[PDB]
Each structure stands twice: as C-alpha cells, then as structure tokens.
Design brief:
glycosidase (chains A, B); 10 helices; part of a larger assembly; Jelly Rolls; binds the ligand CCCCCCCCC[C@@H]1NC[C@@H](O)[C@H](O)[C@H]1C(=O)O; beta-glucuronidase activity (chains A, B); six-stranded antiparallel β-sheet; eight-stranded parallel barrel; EC 3.2.1.31 (chains A, B); 2 chains
Chain lengths: 617, 617
C-alpha cells in the first residue's frame, strides 16, 4: 500500500532509468510478445519521462490507437544488488502497462496517473538487462478517465452517408473529457534498493492537534503530531527523529515494532512552526529501523497544520482561508503530459507572480515532485483522481467502481503526507442531476467514495466533488460534500457574451447555495481567449472579454460571505482533441501555453494582490 | 583529457544529481563564501538541468548580471563508494563555475558548453553531503562566446543625455552574438564511480581504411579500424570486443598496456556494415581491463565510415555528399539553453520530416545525448566551438587564444567517436577582412587553430570556419579552410526585399568562389518571418517572402557543381537579447519556436524530398 518515493541514503540507492529508450508502435488491441525477448526491431528513439505523441512528426502519434512498446537495456554493479531487495518503480505509465524484464512478465497496471512497482530481485541478472514496457493508450466506458465506446468526443459536432462513413472510420479513442489523450511513460522510471530482511514500507505523519495558535499562525504553543510507520520483510525498534528547517533534532522517540509490522505513536512539539499558504515551513521525520554502517532509514518531509471545515468557513490553522487560483494541467509543447520540473518550478513562480495561493490537480494526480515543490513554496492543493467523464453507464459497472476506489486509495496513499494538500476531489463533472432514479443512483455511487476518501486519509481532510454546470435543483449529491466546488460558465456556454444576464443567473444560483449553507467555491469559470485579439468593447475570444468576464463575476461573488474561493479555468492554454470549439486546444488559460500573461492575468494579479490568504471573508 | 560519458555496468555506477535544487542570486562580481559552508538562506527552487533565467517570473533573471549559487544535498550508501574512485561530473555550467563539497573548494572551470569533473573521493563522507555550485554568467572581451566590455548589444540601436545616462546604467552582459545569454546548470550533473587502482580513462576509435566499398555503400569488403585506450590509476592487458548492431561479437583482440598507460592497435572487420546519412549503423567497442568481482569496463559506440574532401567534393564512404539542413540552437521556451531530450528526439524526427540530413551546432557544442541521437538516426553534424563574436581585439589577447584552444581540444576530445560528426568549425563569423595588416592578423590567429583541430582529431576530419558576409576579396583566411562555409543574407540585410538584385549579387560572389576550387556550402541564409503574416506579393516578415527567398536563392546555387550543401538559418525561432530587429527573438526559423512549420518549411520539405544524400552533384 505504501509507495514512498525512492530515496538514496546509507541503506538505499536509486538508479534512474530515464533517458532515450527504443520504441515501436504496435496494434490496436495487441502487440508482439516476442518483442520482450530481444531488442526491438527497427526501433525509434523516445525520451522518457514524456508523452510519446509529440515526439515524432514523421508519424501521427496523436492519432495512434492501442499499444506501443518501449524498451531499453541497463546494467548495475553486482555488489550494489548483492543482498538487497530490488524494486523497479514506474511513476506513471498512461494508461495501462505490461512490464517485462529479461523476457519475464513482471505484471501489469491500469491507473494512468499513479505509480506502480515490481520486485525484480530474482528477475535481475549480472550484465545487461532488457526492460520492455508495453503501454496501452485506450480509453472507453470502463476506464478512468472515461472514453466513449461509440459516437463523438467531448463537446463534439441523420444523413445516411454519415452513418455509413462513421461505421468504417478508423478507430480512435473517443474521450469524454476536454484534454488530449497524451500517453506513454509520462513520468520517471527508476530501479531502487532496500534492505531485504526488514525495511520501511510506509510512513504517515499527521497533525493531530494544535494548542494556542499564534495570531499570525506562524507558530503554535504546542503541536501534537502522530506517526505511523509500516515495515516489510521477514523486540525490534524504530527511532523517529523530528528535524526542523535547520536540521536540528527538536524531538525524538524510539518505538516498538509490533506484528503486519507496524510502529505508531504521538510526539509533542512546543513552539512548533506551522505550515501556511504563502509561508511554508517544513520538518523532516527521520525513521531509522534499529538492529561505517547501520541499517534502514527514510526521511519523510511534512508540515504542521490543521484543516477544518466549520460552518461556511475553511480553516487552516484556525484561520478563515480564501482560495485564489485555478485548475491546472500537466501539459506543455513537446512533453505533452510528461513531467517537466523546469516547467513546474516556473509555474510555481508564476503562481506567486499572480499572487494566487492554490490550484487543483485537474483532472488526475500530478507528478510527485510538484507536490514537494508546493510544500516548500506554500501553495495549497486540491488533489483530484482521474474520475472525469463519468455518468450513469459507469455507476452500474463494478469494474469502474473498483478502479475508482483504487484511484482514491492510491492517490491518498501516495500524497497523504503533503501539508500543501488541504482537500480531496473524488470526481470532475460527473452526471448528478435529472429525474427518476438518476440523482439517487449518482448519490449511491459517490457517497461510499466520499466515505472512502475520509477513511483513507489519516489527516481526515475535507472531501469534495467538482460539479458540472447542471440542474442544481435535482442534483442531490453535490450539496452533501464538505466543500461545494462548482464549475460555472454563465456568459460563455450560455447567455453567451451577455455579462448582465450571466451575473443575474449566477446570483440566482448563488441564492440557492446561500440557502444550502455549505462553504462554496469556484473550481472552474472562464472564457476562451486568443492573445492579440482586442476590442474597445470586448467580444468572446478577445482579451478584453476575458478580463471583463472575471471582473463582473468576481464582483458578484465578493458579496457572498459564504463563498470561500475562486479557482478559475484555466491557469494556461492546453492541448485538446481537435474540434470546432477548440482553437489549437483549450484557450481559457489566463496564460498562453508558453506561460505568457493575457490581459486578464494582469487584472487578476492586481485583484489577488489585494486579497489576503486569511480573513478576506 | 578523456571525458567519457559516465556509464553504469558491473564495474561502474552512475548516481544522477539532477532534480530541484536550492538557488540564490548573488552579486555582480562576488558571492558570499559562507553559502558554500551551510544551507543557502531563504533559497529559491531551481530545476537542473536547465537555464535559470526563465525559471522565475517573480524576478527578472534575464537581466541578471554576475553570479548565482546552486546548492543541494545528497547521500549514497557507504558500500557503494567503498574502495571506489568517486568523480563528480558537470556536463555544462554556463559560463564559469566554482564548485564546493562540504565546505571544501573542489575547483573551478571556465567554458559554458563542455563538461568538467572533480575527484571527490576524499571530500565525500557518509550521510548527507552538501554540494554548492556558484555559476558566473558574465561575458566580455576575453570570453568565448564574446561579450562587449562597453556600448550596446549585437545589432543594437553622441547626445550628452545619452552618454551620461549610459555611464550610469545598470551593468548588463553585452553580447557580441545573436542568441540570449542563457546561464546556469544547463546540462546534467552526476556522481559516478570507477575502480581506483586502474581504470579506463579514454577511448578513441577511428575508421582507418575501407577496401572495396559496395555500390550502395551499405558495406565494405574490409574495414580497418584503430583503437586507442588510455588508462588512469596506479603485464596488464585490455580485451577489446567489437559488437555489431545485434550485439554479436564480430571481432576481438587482447592488447598489452604500456606506459601514461595506453593500449593501441588495429582491427580488421570483414564485410563491415557502414554508417551513412539516412542509414545509420552502429558498432560497440567493449573495453575490458583484465586482472564475484572483476575489474573495469566501458562500452564505446562507433560507426564505420570515412570522410574525405576531394577537389570540390565532400566524400562520405567515397560518395559525393550534399548537405541539406540548417544551423540549430539549443533553445526552448522554459529550459532556455537547458538540455531536453524530449525536444532532441522531436527535433530529430522533424529533421527526417523535412528530408534534411544535417545540421551545425551553432554556436557551441551541444549536449552529448544529441550526438548519440544523431549517431543512431543518421543525421550528419558540423561540430562548432563557442568562438562567436570574435574580432581583432580578441586575436591579440593571450587568454582568448588559450580559451579557444581549450574549446577546440575539449570539443574534439569529447566528441571524436561520433560517426555523425563529419566536420569541425573553429569559429562563427569572426572578423577576417579589411585593409592593412588586419587580414594577416586574422590568418595568423586562425591558421594554428585549424592545425590544432586537425592534430586533435584521430579521424582527421575536415575543418572549416563559418564566414561572415564580408569583403571576400580581402579575406585571406576563409579560402584556406577544407570546406568553405558561408553565411549570406543578400536580399535581407542588404538589397533588402529585392530578390532579383540579391540573386545577381549572390551570383557575382559565386563567380568568385567558383575559381577558388574549394567545396563551398551555405551555413546560413534566411529571413525573419512572423507566422501568420501573409501577402499575395510577399514582403519582408511574411511567410511568402521567406518561401520566395529560399526558392530564388536555391535555384541559383543549383547551377553550381562545386556548391556541396545548403544549411539555412535557422531550424527554429529562438530567444535573443531584446532589440529593434528582434521580434520576440530571432524569427528566421523555418519552424516556429514551438516547432510548427511555416510555409517555407513545407516548400523546403518538398525540395529536399527530391534531393538525394549522394550524387546530387
Ligand atoms: C448551459 C450548459 C453549460 C455547459 C457547462 C459545461 C462546461 C464544461 C467546461 C469544461 N469543464 C472541464 C474541463 O476539463 C474543460 O476544459 C472545461 C472547458 O470546456 O473549458
Ligand atoms: C550587409 C551585410 C551585413 C553583415 C551580415 C551579417 C548577418 C549576420 C547573421 C547572423 N549570423 C549569426 C547568427 O548567430 C545570427 O542569428 C544571424 C542573424 O542575424 O540572423
């Protein structure tokens, strides 16, 4: 269950397997298994980590349907593997993968946005090893994210010629979502080692209680934190040291390991330095398994802070927080969905430049490094599983339910220790409304997932579901979330270009949510905007209209004390499937795809500069 | 002298140090020494490998002048360093660096585009190590590439207000070159191990002779290759096995090591499979130092092919080659000059898409991985040192001369084994013409560098100097190169917009080069072009004008049998210092900065599809 990011220390080494691999496209529903037995014939180069789709302009890999096969060789010193447990970890293979080492199938995985690993201790041998990874890009009615088994894509555009032509068209992934289906080895691949006899398998750190939080929330007189360390392998003990920002041990305990091996307990820290948005502070929990050498160790970063929904407020360290930010995407020009830490570092700086304080991982868990980055940079995150494109067809499918539970458990197991994460999102824009039994069916599907998210998170953070612009009067699910997160496009997708009418409609629905009495925030709202299109009276697609859009809508939500956040759509223009409403993709970015600020970004920067993280409402 | 890329095998391990480091800007001519002794205070995140300049939009790091300081911690298992030689390698730190480990100065380096390394065997210790790297971005009259000590920039735009304001302006780097001065840890950083007592320090493989090359140049009846293995450390022997593309041992010898410890010899390869443009074939030379636990090994890729200038022809494997391609840059939106193998892979695919066969590393050696990529993809390279912006002020400067020799020796030492490299360039557009002694001074400066390039390369490839559009009648240097490489902008920088006149002037200079009797090629020609600007009669900056420009110019050089190549400027739009002729940088790319094809790219693709690598002229 534990998926601690690979670490190098005196007991452990990490051997990265990133670089330029060999690559071949394969079939729509199969690939030659014998490619695992020998070097790929006539291979293409393919960099990893990275989406494969934009890495070859001779081919049209964006149109590819089905399987591809990656391959590379590697060798490590015998003395490095000797006596060690050898683990091969894939940070992400999108969407499904079969992995072979030296011709042996290690196993398979389906989640396209969460890490998986294999014990390769016995499959490894001395000298060159052959690692073959088949990756499947297919989406459909039983995958998360959701594809369509027939028809059209998301927001897509009677005639007999059409029916016949459609029946013989080349097979394509038909996504029920608005972002391009970038596939492949999107995140890092690495071999790593642990001790074999006994080893640290998982660590969970929680902030249990804060006593006498300072007025500025910089410190608390006392902080009670809890630790939970799980072990694998096989009067044993683990030592736990708490290190402050300077590396000073400010607390330490030695705990007994009890048999499923586990050690758990609490630690009191006086004058604890708290983690806040805009003012990060990180401790390190060092776990050392006890017996020019010693034994196993792991260093787990964490931050001390509480999160609590109280009435219509969202309290971080007892202070009323206001979200400023956006949904993002892991999306960029050559990498596609490939992780890029240069871009992550830049984007975090841009979030500061904008005076935003938060974002949501729309619509899939992001690369782990981005959460570490936001931990140290004081940026708050809503962590979201790839459950986008869902409707009643999915709710009745047990395989989908299991994959959804897998995604929630996987995300929370991977990300539980990040102080920057303050809330979980269990879906984006599922079908929730309508008549007959449909609302009840949606509720019965999502409620146990809400409960699972609460049970899985030792910190017990709030849980939301990001809601589509729907009939809010027949939707009975969204109102039961801890925070109401709504996606609204009044004035863009309806009442188009009419901001007076858009504001009127918005205010009517806001009267509804006011009456609901839950804290509410925007998680999406915006307008496609082509940089350089200008007007004295801004029309749809102009920079001025995007600017006007946010000025009008935000003036309306400023009047509502129970409206605790504004996350717009989107941080930056991003790639989608082609279609009549997509001008080189989705253009609702306040930044261009190359991260350049449109007029609305400047306006928002000015607004957000005057809005404090705490106490705005 | 040897700088073999770090390799992992049974005798060696590589520990990458890439990732998100700590970072601070520092002073114009200094940095705080105590930053090397303890964790950086209030650090910024900075991804490495990458330029730092575009990784923080809160700061204006493009305007930064002077030093910055990088830092990170790392730990490796004691059992892995035990008894090993520990080397810390920097693939590139631009432009100069001081490196510290655990408070100790390891040493310094100048030269922003070639690797350097330090023996850290004694400076390393158990647990966390603190690695600090100060990086200097300053350029001036004694650096390569060349900066200006005062004035304005490359192609930059008496009045007392101006003189006085200039004297008090913020200090900035003033480039004598047309690409932005991206600085920092542009390429990978890694720790690696070798055996300590004796180890392989360098390998050189050369194609000495080909007997009876096949008609299609796919094979030769016999290939004589030579090996040269250098050792460090301290009846010893090294075994050398030659592996073909399938990993089959096709040849092998055991050689004696003699003292500077060295083994050298020749190997005949029967029915050798040759490396050609558009049809790569690679062998591996496995060098194993002879005495569980064994000794030392390194696997050196190579390709079997000859390069020979004969009269006005450029012969690869005895066949008359024609260059199709462009100058490139290592340049991209967030990385700056940072190496990005996703982008390298994509770019190589685009080179195939265009039906080009070559490029030049304008204006600095590229990341090593790109040469490996071109080795396997059959793309020919002209390898160039950062000697750009040079004039007579530099030729009289001993420090410049020494740095130039360092760049040539370093480049060739690093890159000698790549079959894709067919030619060295010792400078781009230096001052060579004029009256009095200036031409002779230039000749006396460059001739020994020409000679040095020939002496340093065991393959003895042709050597060129890429020549500025100058007075070809007083230039006495360019005509003495092995291949004449000219940069010409008739119709753009002069005879502006008049393609008839441009072609007339071109034909007059071509009449000059016709009599020189050297093979001649374009290494630059082009027109700034803003994608989306159109006209029925294309004017400067329109897509049509760029297209017309290449159509007319190329029609003229097609009439000259001695004109053996066309490399245009540039592959893709790239970042420059700001100025009145730079619209978001240099826009002479036939592709946009995001690698999208302008009209001229389609036209060129069509032309190049009909031009064979061999036998065009
Ligand atoms: C009156 C009907 C209103 C329809 C509301 C549906 C809006 C969905 C908006 C979409 N929501 C999800 C996101 O991934 C997409 O990029 C975003 C978009 O299209 O820009
Ligand atoms: C009338 C003749 C004036 C001299 C012409 C010199 C042209 C130099 C061209 C420049 N040559 C070098 C290259 O790095 C630059 O990017 C390129 C350019 O500006 O586009």
């Amino acid at each position: 269950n534990g998926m601690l990011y690979p670490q190098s220390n005196d007991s452990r080494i990490v051997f990265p397997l990133d670089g330029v691999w060999d690559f071949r496209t394969a079939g729509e529903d199969s690939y030659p298994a014998e490619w695992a037995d020998a070097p790929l014939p006539e291979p293409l180069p393919m960099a990893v980590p990275g989406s494969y789709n934009d890495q070859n302009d001779e081919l049209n890999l964006r149109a590819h349907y089905g399987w591809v096969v990656y391959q590379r060789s590697f060798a490590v010193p015998s003395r490095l593997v000797a006596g060690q447990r050898m683990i091969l970890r894939f940070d992400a293979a999108t969407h499904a993968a079969d992995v072979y080492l030296n011709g042996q199938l290690l196993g398979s995985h389906f989640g396209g946005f969460l890490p998986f690993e294999f014990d390769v201790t016995s499959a490894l041998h001395a000298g060159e090893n052959l690692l073959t990874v088949a990756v499947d890009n297919r989406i459909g009615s039983s995958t998360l994210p959701v594809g369509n088994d027939a028809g059209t894509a998301f927001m897509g555009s009677n005639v007999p010629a059409v029916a016949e032509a459609k029946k013989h068209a080349r097979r394509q992934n038909l996504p029920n979502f608005d972002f391009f289906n970038f596939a492949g080895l999107n995140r890092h691949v690495e071999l790593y080692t642990t001790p074999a006899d006994a080893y640290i398998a998982d660590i969970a750190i929680t902030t249990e209680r804060l006593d006498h939080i300072a007025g500025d929330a910089c410190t608390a007189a006392n902080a009670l934190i809890a630790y939970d360390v799980t072990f694998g392998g096989d009067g044993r003990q683990v030592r736990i040291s708490i290190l402050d920002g300077e590396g000073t041990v400010v607390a330490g305990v030695t705990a007994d390991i009890e048999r499923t091996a586990k050690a758990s307990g609490e630690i009191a820290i006086r004058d604890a330095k708290l983690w806040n948005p805009g003012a990060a502070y990180l401790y390190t929990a060092v776990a050392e398994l006890l017996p020019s050498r010693i034994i196993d160790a792991y260093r787990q970063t964490f931050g001390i802070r509480t999160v609590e929904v109280s009435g219509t407020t969202f309290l971080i360290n007892g202070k009323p927080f206001y979200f400023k930010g956006f949904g993002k995407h892991e999306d960029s020009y050559f990498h596609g969905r490939g992780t890029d830490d240069v871009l992550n570092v830049k984007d975090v700086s841009l979030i500061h430049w904008l005076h935003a304080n938060s974002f949501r991982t729309s619509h899939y868990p992001y690369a782990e490094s981005m959460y570490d980055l936001c931990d140290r940079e004081g940026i708050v995150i809503i962590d979201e599983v790839p459950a986008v494109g869902m409707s009643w067809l999915q709710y009745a499918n047990p395989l989908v339910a299991e994959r959804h539970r897998e995604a929630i458990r996987g995300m929370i197991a991977r990300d539980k220790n990040h102080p920057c994460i303050v809330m979980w999102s269990i879906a984006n824009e599922p079908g929730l409304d309508g008549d007959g039994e449909r609302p009840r069916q949606a509720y019965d599907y999502f409620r146990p997932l809400y409960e699972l998210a609460h049970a899985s998170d030792p910190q017990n953070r709030p849980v939301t579901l990001v809601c589509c612009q729907n009939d809010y009067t027949t939707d009975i699910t969204e109102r039961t979330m801890d925070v109401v997160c709504i996606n609204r496009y009044y004035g863009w997708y309806n009442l188009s270009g009419d901001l007076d009418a858009a504001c009127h409609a918005l205010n009517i629905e806001l009267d509804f949510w006011e009456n609901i009495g839950k804290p509410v925030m925007f998680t999406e709202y915006g307008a496609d905007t082509i940089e350089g299109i200008h007007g004295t009276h801004g029309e749809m697609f102009s920079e001025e209209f995007q600017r006007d859009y946010y000025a009008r809508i935000n003036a309306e939500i400023d009047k509502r004390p129970w409206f605790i956040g504004e996350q717009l759509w989107n941080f930056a223009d991003f790639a989608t499937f082609q279609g009549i409403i997509r001008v080189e993709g989705n253009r609702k970015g306040i930044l261009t795809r190359d991260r350049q600020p449109k007029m609305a970004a400047h306006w928002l920067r000015e607004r957000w500069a005057g809005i404090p993280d705490y106490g705005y409402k």
